[PDB]
Design an enzyme around this catalytic site. Structure first.
Site, PDB file in Angstrom:
ATOM      1  N   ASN A  68     -93.257   6.257 -38.570  1.00  0.00           N
ATOM      2  CA  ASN A  68     -94.667   6.575 -38.476  1.00  0.00           C
ATOM      3  C   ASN A  68     -95.061   7.792 -39.294  1.00  0.00           C
ATOM      4  OD1 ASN A  68     -93.227   8.202 -36.384  1.00  0.00           O
ATOM      5  ND2 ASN A  68     -93.541   6.326 -35.182  1.00  0.00           N
ATOM      6  N   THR A  69     -94.815   8.986 -38.762  1.00  0.00           N
ATOM      7  CA  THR A  69     -95.205  10.204 -39.459  1.00  0.00           C
ATOM      8  C   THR A  69     -94.524  10.467 -40.799  1.00  0.00           C
ATOM      9  OG1 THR A  69     -93.789  11.387 -37.871  1.00  0.00           O
ATOM     10  CG2 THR A  69     -96.176  11.470 -37.519  1.00  0.00           C
ATOM     11  N   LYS A  76     -93.221  -1.465 -26.504  1.00  0.00           N
ATOM     12  CA  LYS A  76     -92.256  -0.427 -26.836  1.00  0.00           C
ATOM     13  C   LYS A  76     -92.286   0.572 -25.691  1.00  0.00           C
ATOM     14  CE  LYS A  76     -91.507   3.636 -29.727  1.00  0.00           C
ATOM     15  NZ  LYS A  76     -91.735   4.322 -31.030  1.00  0.00           N
TER      16      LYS A  76
END
Lengths: 244, 251, 249, 249
Positions: free
Chosen positions: D206-207, D97
């Site tokens: 993610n978060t 990525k």
């Protein structure tokens, strides 16, 4: 057609509130540069219960801010009239201390009673579409749906509902409060509103006089755009526009 | 401090496009009531490029305005440079609007070619103003080449949707060291005012005005909107009340 | 938590409408995969009237569902009460959805007639759930009449727009003392999920599922969406980062 | 269909980040319940980049997943390439990525450095997936370099605002010849669902999960949201009703 309420016409489609300015000098200056013809104010919050202004040059729209029931609103309205500070009455019956949004039952009730008593009535209401028609059917002289909650500064939150209200109206529609900047005032007129009522967005600005000027120009600009026939939205036919 | 580009100041923060009005009379009146000081136009579609098409800017006193020809039609940096050079050689270029469309459907700009054309034209001594997307870092990359202004689009050309990403535009204006003028994608006064309310130094409009049923009236509407939005920006508008409901994560 | 209305609990927070599916087989499968426990239907358009209209509940094992007939088609409180009485007499009423449309264009609800019909039906012993607008105080006025749930629309019926005024909806859910179920105006999973993320106790949908090209698959999607939205509400989502830009006065 | 990148297929369309969870135990169960097949992690911030830093992949059974290390932390194309090489040498890279942040305030990507890093990594034999903005033509320039997927951000990293420009994302998805996965900026299920409803091949988060009060429950919510959004995309949602009001010029 020129903004007309209760048979009276007004050159300015901007209704300006008074009372929360930093000083009377600034207030008088703001009122002047706004070129507003209709001044609104909370009756309760006054000595009789705005100085340095020649009221002879304006149409007074006292409001019933502070009222919780129709009865309190009628009491305030009767006092305003008896005090010689009422050309038209803005019916305002707040039913929520948190959002400050209007109580429909009490607004409907107060509006009917004040019409029976001979007042030129303009109710502050929500953007509930059928409610607006209900108010009109009572015989009110204008309908004033809020763009968003009083003092929210968020602008118009439901353009679709406002569009329905304006398109079905038989009396002027003036977007009342919840306005934050010129873009919101302009948008209201762009949707076809007959006017806009502002207060804290102007008096609460760091420079009230300048903001009053800005709002005057924005209301004019929005109205001109409405009359000018703006360009449509281009249709791309992507997934972000289902059905297109 | 009025709008200043390449050392030159302008009383009007409204940049007006010319060339697609229903008539030269209407265009002239529109230009006048707009009070615009900078007129922009697609030079490639004028008589100077080929005598099979009428020329814009007709009936206009070019001496009373700053000309901002654009490179509309260009697909590569080289084509943009070709157009710009011809515009300058023809005496119709005070500053050049670099426009390199890279998508036939959306009409959105090609970042690679825009960076390339901008760098080349700067080397050739032009006062350069690139039309770009609202890609935040890309805007700074363009500024770093030494362009004289950055012109991020509010939304796709001719969409009439107004500003689609005010957050990105906010980032672009807040980091800029040269003026930021929101370019096209504008549909009505509310959009023009909003651009100024966010801190833009100006707005460039074309079809929104020329395409209205009453171009002259809309021209006046846009002039007022830009002034109103700018005034609001300077006046310090009220903040948004915080209610702390679920519709606002973090109160 | 578990959706509770009139003292009765339901494992699914997804309420589903019946009657507008392409066929009864598809409707039956869509209802099954949705896992919904409460089904609504417009009694006015059913066989239980003068002319034999269709039986929207054909092929369904009703012992597996709680019935929420609605008064769609009513223009006044009087007509809504009559429709509700009909459903009750036909043995197809566990709770009643009061719907009185006051605008033929927008199909938005009539607040006065809705207030009136709700009070009348409560007097007549029904468990009452009024369909209403996103007018915040109006929602409280309905609750204060003693209804068992409030059902504010996300947007006008069949608009597919989703939630147009999340702020108003937020105030309605935060002040409520009875369950709040977002009703119609829903267009896709993102909207159903948002309703739950705002704290709604449930979502009621109809054409967004029945009108899709693949009703059964969309029923599955909505089931998952309502579940996801609710889980998110419970999980405590992350806040909006503040950048201090002009776009955030 | 099934999410396919570089010829490899994946059952789950949900990509999940690791390393920012309250604990490795919570991270493990979250990854498990999410049913994700692809995990991403910032190499520059873990042990393999500096022994003084921890291993975000502790307790995880890496053989059960496809690894997508990211170059978060890189400010230039050169640094990104270096991070990628390290990940590969550490045996922790199936696909890379590419992430080159160019703004410390917004954390938005640098288009020039991203273009450069993607080209170099492709030359070095990596399966490349660039994180990019919603700049429509930029997305195509990246594809034309030969990358295997494009990952436009819904909004700035950690903003929690969801998709800010659906129109642009729509153009990116409709023009793409490789998979499009909406990356970060996601805040709740409604956003993940919307991304899929627009036709994205997947979502990377993610978060929004690791930062929730209950990461495990939110991971489940996102799994369901991505599934719901995809089902809706396939099911053919209802159109937007047009009322012909001034609010729709």
């Amino acid at each position: 057609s020129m903004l007309t309420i209760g048979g009276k016409s007004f050159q300015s489609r901007l209704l300006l509130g008074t009372g929360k300015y930093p000083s009377f000098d600034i207030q008088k200056e703001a009122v002047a540069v706004s070129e507003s013809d209709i001044l609104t104010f909370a009756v309760r919050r006054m000595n009789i219960f705005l100085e340095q202004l020649d009221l002879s040059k304006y149409t007074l729209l006292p409001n019933t801010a502070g009222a919780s029931t129709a009865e309190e609103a009628v009491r305030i309205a009767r006092l305003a009239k008896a005090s010689g500070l009422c050309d038209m009455i803005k019916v305002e019956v707040i039913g929520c201390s948190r959002s400050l949004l209007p109580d429909p039952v009490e607004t409907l009730k107060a509006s009917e009673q004040l019409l029976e008593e001979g007042f030129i009535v303009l109710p502050y209401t929500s953007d509930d579409v059928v409610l607006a028609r209900k108010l009109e059917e009572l015989g009110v002289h204008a309908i004033m749906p809020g763009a968003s909650p009083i003092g929210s500064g968020q602008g118009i939150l439901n353009p679709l509902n406002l569009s329905f209200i304006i398109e079905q109206a038989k009396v002027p529609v003036i977007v009342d409060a919840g306005i934050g900047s010129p873009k919101d005032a302009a948008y209201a007129m762009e949707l076809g509103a007959d006017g806009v009522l502002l207060n804290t967005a102007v008096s609460g600005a760091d420079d009230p006089v300048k903001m009053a000027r800005a709002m005057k120009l924005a209301v004019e600009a929005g109205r001109l755009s409405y009359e000018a026939g703006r360009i449509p939205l281009k249709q791309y036919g992507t997934a972000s526009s289902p059905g297109e």
